[PDB]
Design a protein around this nucleic acid. Structure first.
Ligand SMILES: [Mg+2]
Ligand SMILES: [Mg+2]
Ligand SMILES: [Mg+2]
Ligand SMILES: [Mg+2]
Ligand SMILES: [Mg+2]
Ligand SMILES: [Mg+2]
Ligand SMILES: [Mg+2]
Ligand SMILES: [Mg+2]
Ligand SMILES: [Mg+2]
Ligand SMILES: [Mg+2]
Ligand SMILES: [Mg+2]
Ligand SMILES: [Mg+2]
Ligand SMILES: [Mg+2]
Ligand SMILES: [Mg+2]
Ligand SMILES: [Mg+2]
Ligand SMILES: [Mg+2]
Ligand SMILES: [Mg+2]
Ligand SMILES: [Mg+2]
Ligand SMILES: [Mg+2]
Ligand SMILES: [Mg+2]
Ligand SMILES: [Mg+2]
Ligand SMILES: [Mg+2]
Ligand SMILES: [Mg+2]
Ligand SMILES: [Mg+2]
Ligand SMILES: [Mg+2]
Ligand SMILES: [Mg+2]
Ligand SMILES: [Mg+2]
Ligand SMILES: [Mg+2]
Ligand SMILES: [Mg+2]
Ligand SMILES: [Mg+2]
Ligand SMILES: [Mg+2]
Ligand SMILES: [Mg+2]
Ligand SMILES: [Mg+2]
Ligand SMILES: [Mg+2]
Ligand SMILES: [Mg+2]
Ligand SMILES: [Mg+2]
Ligand SMILES: [Mg+2]
Ligand SMILES: [Mg+2]
Ligand SMILES: [Mg+2]
Ligand SMILES: [Mg+2]
Ligand SMILES: [Mg+2]
Ligand SMILES: [Mg+2]
Ligand SMILES: [Mg+2]
Ligand SMILES: [Mg+2]
Ligand SMILES: [Mg+2]
Ligand SMILES: [Mg+2]
Ligand SMILES: [Mg+2]
Ligand SMILES: [Mg+2]
Ligand SMILES: [Mg+2]
Ligand SMILES: [Mg+2]
Ligand SMILES: [Mg+2]
Ligand SMILES: [Mg+2]
Ligand SMILES: [Mg+2]
Ligand SMILES: [Mg+2]
Ligand SMILES: [Mg+2]
Ligand SMILES: [Mg+2]
Ligand SMILES: [Mg+2]
Ligand SMILES: [Mg+2]
Ligand SMILES: [Mg+2]
Ligand SMILES: [Mg+2]
Ligand SMILES: [Mg+2]
Ligand SMILES: [Mg+2]
Ligand SMILES: [Mg+2]
Ligand SMILES: [Mg+2]
Ligand SMILES: [Mg+2]
Ligand SMILES: [Mg+2]
Ligand SMILES: [Mg+2]
Ligand SMILES: [Mg+2]
Ligand SMILES: [Mg+2]
Ligand SMILES: [Mg+2]
Ligand SMILES: [Mg+2]
Ligand SMILES: [Mg+2]
Ligand SMILES: [Mg+2]
Ligand SMILES: [Mg+2]
Ligand SMILES: [Mg+2]
Ligand SMILES: [Mg+2]
Ligand SMILES: [Mg+2]
Ligand SMILES: [Mg+2]
Ligand SMILES: [Mg+2]
Ligand SMILES: [Mg+2]
Ligand SMILES: [Mg+2]
Ligand SMILES: [Mg+2]
Ligand SMILES: [Mg+2]
Ligand SMILES: [Mg+2]
Ligand SMILES: [Mg+2]
Ligand SMILES: [Mg+2]
Ligand SMILES: [Mg+2]
Ligand SMILES: [Mg+2]
Ligand SMILES: [Mg+2]
Ligand SMILES: [Mg+2]
Ligand SMILES: [Mg+2]
Ligand SMILES: [Mg+2]
Ligand SMILES: [Mg+2]
Ligand SMILES: [Mg+2]
Ligand SMILES: [Mg+2]
Ligand SMILES: [Mg+2]
Ligand SMILES: [Mg+2]
Ligand SMILES: [Mg+2]
Ligand SMILES: [Mg+2]
Ligand SMILES: [Mg+2]
Ligand SMILES: [Mg+2]
Ligand SMILES: [Mg+2]
Ligand SMILES: [Mg+2]
Ligand SMILES: [Mg+2]
Ligand SMILES: [Mg+2]
Ligand SMILES: [Mg+2]
Ligand SMILES: [Mg+2]
Ligand SMILES: [Mg+2]
Ligand SMILES: [Mg+2]
Ligand SMILES: [Mg+2]
Ligand SMILES: [Mg+2]
Ligand SMILES: [Mg+2]
Ligand SMILES: [Mg+2]
Ligand SMILES: [Mg+2]
Ligand SMILES: [Mg+2]
Ligand SMILES: [Mg+2]
Ligand SMILES: [Mg+2]
Ligand SMILES: [Mg+2]
Ligand SMILES: [Mg+2]
Ligand SMILES: [Mg+2]
Ligand SMILES: [Mg+2]
Ligand SMILES: [Mg+2]
Ligand SMILES: [Mg+2]
Ligand SMILES: [Mg+2]
Ligand SMILES: [Mg+2]
Ligand SMILES: [Mg+2]
Ligand SMILES: [Mg+2]
Ligand SMILES: [Mg+2]
Ligand SMILES: [Mg+2]
Ligand SMILES: [Mg+2]
Ligand SMILES: [Mg+2]
Ligand SMILES: [Mg+2]
Ligand SMILES: [Mg+2]
Ligand SMILES: [Mg+2]
Ligand SMILES: [Mg+2]
Ligand SMILES: [Mg+2]
Ligand SMILES: [Mg+2]
Ligand SMILES: [Mg+2]
Ligand SMILES: [Mg+2]
Ligand SMILES: [Mg+2]
Lengths: 133, 122
RNA sequence: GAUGCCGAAGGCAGGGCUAGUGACUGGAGUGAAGUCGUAACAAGGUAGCCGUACUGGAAGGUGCGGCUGGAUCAC
RNA sequence: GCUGAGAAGCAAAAGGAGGAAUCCGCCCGAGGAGGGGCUCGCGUCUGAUUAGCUAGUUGGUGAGGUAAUAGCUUACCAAGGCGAUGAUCAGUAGCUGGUCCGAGAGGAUGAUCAGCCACACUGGGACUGAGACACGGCCCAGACUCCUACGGGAGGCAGCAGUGGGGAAUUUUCCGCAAUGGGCGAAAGCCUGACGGAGCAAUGCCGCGUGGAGGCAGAAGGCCCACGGGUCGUGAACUUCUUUUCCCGGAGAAGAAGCAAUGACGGUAUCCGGGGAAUAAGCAUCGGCUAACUCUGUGCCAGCAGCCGCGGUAAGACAGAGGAUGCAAGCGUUAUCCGGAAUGAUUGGGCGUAAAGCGUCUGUAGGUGGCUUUUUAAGUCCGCCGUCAAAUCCCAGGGCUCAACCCUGGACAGGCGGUGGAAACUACCAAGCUGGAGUACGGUAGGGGCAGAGGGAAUUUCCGGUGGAGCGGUGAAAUGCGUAGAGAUCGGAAAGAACACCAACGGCGAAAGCACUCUGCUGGGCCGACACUGACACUGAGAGACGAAAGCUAGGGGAGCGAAUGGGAUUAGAUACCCCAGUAGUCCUAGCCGUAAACGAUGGAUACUAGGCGCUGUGCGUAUCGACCCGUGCAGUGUUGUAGCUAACGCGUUAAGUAUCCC
RNA sequence: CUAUAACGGUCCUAAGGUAGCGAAAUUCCUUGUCGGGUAAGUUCCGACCCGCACGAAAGGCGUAACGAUCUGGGCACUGUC
């Protein structure tokens, strides 16, 4: 648990590859925000919170299998960019865009977390958390 | 691999190693022939190859190949040698430019004459 | 003018580093064809390999320990 | 103005032009701009087979010195300064605007052109001066060249040309101050091998040419041909048109700047006329990559080749011919650099078997590090300013007929510095929180380790009794042991070493390893409870400890086994396999060695991803109220196997899967 | 290819000289041959091995320190010359 962000991302990727809709993730401001964003983008069905023994679990419903489990044309990819060993930052004009914009990029900036779209409207650069296909 | 390790300078390039050290970074060098003789090629290529040992301006002694058909070269002759490798003979990394200094041009060669140092026939 | 201090070559001495060369000798590489053997690959005709010690013209042999990248048979 | 607390003390000049006006000067202050001197942050090659270096060295005072701060100098005081983030030492190198390459990230390099440094025959000094430790100045020493009437002198091309020499290789002992720039002068002007030009050279980049249009489909010739014909080929010859270039004549600039004058280039660039297709195409390649094919000549010869490789009688790979293809006033070969090369990998690789996981731990520096709230604003982000010289690259126009080249204007990057904001993430500051890591408590399994007791088979030898010919051994034998009584058998002693069954695809250990039994000293591990601390974590360069067997030093001990050694065979030989003997060693104490297929051929931590069948230790519920039994929670351990991974084999919750960190 | 002999045959013994060293306090022929030191070296140092006739407790081979030891060379110094 040296990195929480990468961990969330990873659990998602694993549950996804295994064709399961439901994931338990540990909550945190970052986690919660990231998931919110993930919802307003439409990458994930629904999110909700649970509590036991002062632990918080966000469970995430995931988009249903593609017209069977066997014949899948599409998966859902996640990639950590800035990680504890190398922190990647970008100014306004270097802000990444994924596959011509089909995917998104998550930024942590002065005004909070957002997508690259929001950064382009508001004109801010910052730290790039991950890429999402 | 580990960034921390890369910052100890764990990537270093392998320098370019020349194929003709005796030239010392030159297109050609002039030399005098110590000996002219023949050698047999590595099998299964059998023939008799024309080679001469040349002592150069850069001081080295090498063994260089003489192209074409026939030659007038003999000891205490001043020739000009150029690079390039003969896959046949072990140790022979150098040719002898034909048609300059003491090596005349190949007699009666009509085609690709520039390689062998031959005038154009009228 | 003379003289003191500092003073470059020049001198001597021992050092560190490198260049070349040297009777003889140790091994390495390539040489179709030479000599001696046949160690290795099949259970390679005593299973093979690693460490190590002793010995042998030479590949090697045996001892001690280890492993299967061991065949046969056990399933 | 300078010295100085002050009192005081001390310091300057130059005239020349003109008939006069006035001009160019002179001395002392005080500014300005430009040019220099210093000082500091950052960036500024390879080597650990270079690990300690430094004593005016690192600082303090007092005196000196410098244009100025300063160990710049000197005396005294103190003991620092630098260094595993690479000092010192060695090796290489002028650096930067830039140039070449690259999709980019960045690699290599520093010619011309522009800035800076450094040097001037080899070393060292100063002098003059605003400025030098001074290329065509001085002084000395040294090496070398010249002149000398031999007593003495002269000199410094890494200035322009030029000669020798070295070399694969790099140009005329040319013209001119007309332009621009310098120096001196009141000006006239003088000097400028800076510079402006010419000449030589395909060295390179760019433009143009070597003809345009038509040309019976008939002939000569080359070559191929199944002799039918194909192909050089509209190609030439041939007929017309044109004249860039060539040749012969004419005229002829801008460049020159405001009084005319003054042009090295040059009678050149350009413009007009007269002839006339007239003056002008080569070089590689043709096996595959790679575009382009056949024939004669040769026969593992002669030769080719960038790699693979061709060539022993019909060679698309040699040499010749014809034909074709590629480029074209160039075409090839060699050298150098980047590319392709993901082949040193940040973007962008790997480590079970292909090269590659230290033998295994403990841990120092170092790197990363859980959640919540606040703070700060170092990173990070946004705005504005300064600068990062001009030339080059990029964009937009303009000029030489075009292009190359030149000129104007402008800018993205990206760097550094100042300032105003933002506060999510890293970082900091203050307080919190348990799920990570620990402590206490209570349990429980264990060949964990060290130390001390005890036990039995078996074997060997020795002492007897019996007995009386072979034992032992091999594929078959023999050496060997035996009538001096062997082996066999019974009874006795003595000694050492190893621990049958249990034992199992079982247990513990960090690994190595650890098992007859017992007891003592002690290391961990796991499980259940909130009892508690509250991030104390994970890894680990150097460093430390442990580390099978063999081996060694010193002292013991010595049954069996057994390197070496000896004998017997086997065999062409047998320094081997087999047999008979048997020394080191194997054991114990105290050390050293530090290696193994030290293997899961798989570094460690964490998080997350179907199962099925098993086992060990425990806990819970159930079953009975104690052994099962069942279902389950953990911790480890084994076998099949889904997703996914992999070159395949296979791995697959004990990953070789999906991610993060360290080595 | 000349050479030499890792390899084989045979003879004889109780067995046939291993490690290391080697023209040596051991080498006869012999001032062996080669290298070095010297203008010139029968001595000296290093090496070859053809050890007349090395050799393992009559020890073999190394070796720092030491010697009124034996033996070669050099600087200083001198009537040794
Ligand atoms: Mg930046
Ligand atoms: Mg990488
Ligand atoms: Mg290359
Ligand atoms: Mg000196
Ligand atoms: Mg000396
Ligand atoms: Mg030899
Ligand atoms: Mg050899
Ligand atoms: Mg041969
Ligand atoms: Mg064999
Ligand atoms: Mg075998
Ligand atoms: Mg085998
Ligand atoms: Mg043996
Ligand atoms: Mg034996
Ligand atoms: Mg064994
Ligand atoms: Mg006065
Ligand atoms: Mg005066
Ligand atoms: Mg006058
Ligand atoms: Mg007057
Ligand atoms: Mg002034
Ligand atoms: Mg550089
Ligand atoms: Mg002092
Ligand atoms: Mg590239
Ligand atoms: Mg130059
Ligand atoms: Mg310059
Ligand atoms: Mg100077
Ligand atoms: Mg000179
Ligand atoms: Mg000087
Ligand atoms: Mg002065
Ligand atoms: Mg001067
Ligand atoms: Mg000077
Ligand atoms: Mg000069
Ligand atoms: Mg002099
Ligand atoms: Mg002089
Ligand atoms: Mg003079
Ligand atoms: Mg010159
Ligand atoms: Mg010359
Ligand atoms: Mg020359
Ligand atoms: Mg040239
Ligand atoms: Mg002028
Ligand atoms: Mg002027
Ligand atoms: Mg003036
Ligand atoms: Mg002139
Ligand atoms: Mg010029
Ligand atoms: Mg010409
Ligand atoms: Mg030209
Ligand atoms: Mg020309
Ligand atoms: Mg040329
Ligand atoms: Mg051209
Ligand atoms: Mg035509
Ligand atoms: Mg005309
Ligand atoms: Mg023209
Ligand atoms: Mg005028
Ligand atoms: Mg004309
Ligand atoms: Mg083709
Ligand atoms: Mg060819
Ligand atoms: Mg080439
Ligand atoms: Mg044939
Ligand atoms: Mg024939
Ligand atoms: Mg033929
Ligand atoms: Mg024919
Ligand atoms: Mg040909
Ligand atoms: Mg031809
Ligand atoms: Mg070329
Ligand atoms: Mg590369
Ligand atoms: Mg490589
Ligand atoms: Mg690889
Ligand atoms: Mg292998
Ligand atoms: Mg391997
Ligand atoms: Mg390991
Ligand atoms: Mg290993
Ligand atoms: Mg180790
Ligand atoms: Mg550790
Ligand atoms: Mg620490
Ligand atoms: Mg931290
Ligand atoms: Mg955090
Ligand atoms: Mg610029
Ligand atoms: Mg343009
Ligand atoms: Mg134009
Ligand atoms: Mg410009
Ligand atoms: Mg900027
Ligand atoms: Mg800034
Ligand atoms: Mg905050
Ligand atoms: Mg805290
Ligand atoms: Mg014990
Ligand atoms: Mg008993
Ligand atoms: Mg009897
Ligand atoms: Mg007998
Ligand atoms: Mg007896
Ligand atoms: Mg009796
Ligand atoms: Mg008996
Ligand atoms: Mg006993
Ligand atoms: Mg275990
Ligand atoms: Mg055991
Ligand atoms: Mg215990
Ligand atoms: Mg508390
Ligand atoms: Mg280590
Ligand atoms: Mg130890
Ligand atoms: Mg042992
Ligand atoms: Mg021994
Ligand atoms: Mg002993
Ligand atoms: Mg015994
Ligand atoms: Mg035995
Ligand atoms: Mg024997
Ligand atoms: Mg004996
Ligand atoms: Mg025998
Ligand atoms: Mg025995
Ligand atoms: Mg021991
Ligand atoms: Mg090893
Ligand atoms: Mg083992
Ligand atoms: Mg049961
Ligand atoms: Mg488990
Ligand atoms: Mg397995
Ligand atoms: Mg499996
Ligand atoms: Mg793998
Ligand atoms: Mg013979
Ligand atoms: Mg024999
Ligand atoms: Mg023999
Ligand atoms: Mg025999
Ligand atoms: Mg006998
Ligand atoms: Mg005997
Ligand atoms: Mg015998
Ligand atoms: Mg011997
Ligand atoms: Mg031996
Ligand atoms: Mg010897
Ligand atoms: Mg002698
Ligand atoms: Mg002796
Ligand atoms: Mg002797
Ligand atoms: Mg004698
Ligand atoms: Mg000599
Ligand atoms: Mg001699
Ligand atoms: Mg003497
Ligand atoms: Mg001697
Ligand atoms: Mg003897
Ligand atoms: Mg003796
Ligand atoms: Mg004796
Ligand atoms: Mg003695
Ligand atoms: Mg001694
Ligand atoms: Mg004494
Ligand atoms: Mg003295
Ligand atoms: Mg006297």
């Amino acid at each position: 648990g040296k990195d929480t962000i990468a961990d969330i991302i990873t659990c998602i990727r694993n549950a996804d590859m295994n064709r399961k809709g439901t994931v338990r993730i540990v909550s945190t401001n970052i986690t919660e925000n990231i998931v919110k964003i993930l919802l307003r983008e439409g990458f994930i069905e629904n999110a909700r919170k649970h509590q036991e023994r002062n632990k918080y679990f966000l469970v995430l419903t995931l988009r249903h299998r593609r017209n069977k489990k066997g014949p899948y044309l599409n998966t859902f990819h996640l990639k950590r960019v800035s990680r504890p060993g190398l922190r990647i930052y970008s100014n306004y004009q270097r802000i990444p865009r994924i596959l011509g914009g089909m995917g998104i990029a998550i930024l942590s900036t002065s005004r909070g977390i957002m997508t690259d779209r929001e950064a382009r409207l508001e004109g801010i650069g910052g730290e790039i958390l991950c890429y999402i296909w | 691999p580990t960034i921390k390790q890369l910052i100890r300078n764990t990537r270093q390039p392998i320098r370019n190693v020349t194929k003709s050290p005796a030239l010392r970074g030159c297109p050609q060098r002039r030399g005098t022939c110590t000996r002219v003789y023949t050698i047999t090629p590595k099998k299964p290529n059998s023939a008799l190859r024309k080679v001469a040992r040349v002592r150069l301006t850069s001081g080295f002694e090498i063994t260089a190949y003489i192209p074409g058909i026939g030659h007038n070269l003999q000891e205490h002759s001043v020739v000009l040698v150029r690079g390039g490798r003969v896959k046949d003979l072990p140790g022979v990394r150098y040719h002898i430019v034909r048609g300059t200094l003491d090596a005349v041009g190949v007699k009666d060669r009509q085609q690709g004459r520039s390689k062998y140092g031959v005038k154009k026939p009228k």
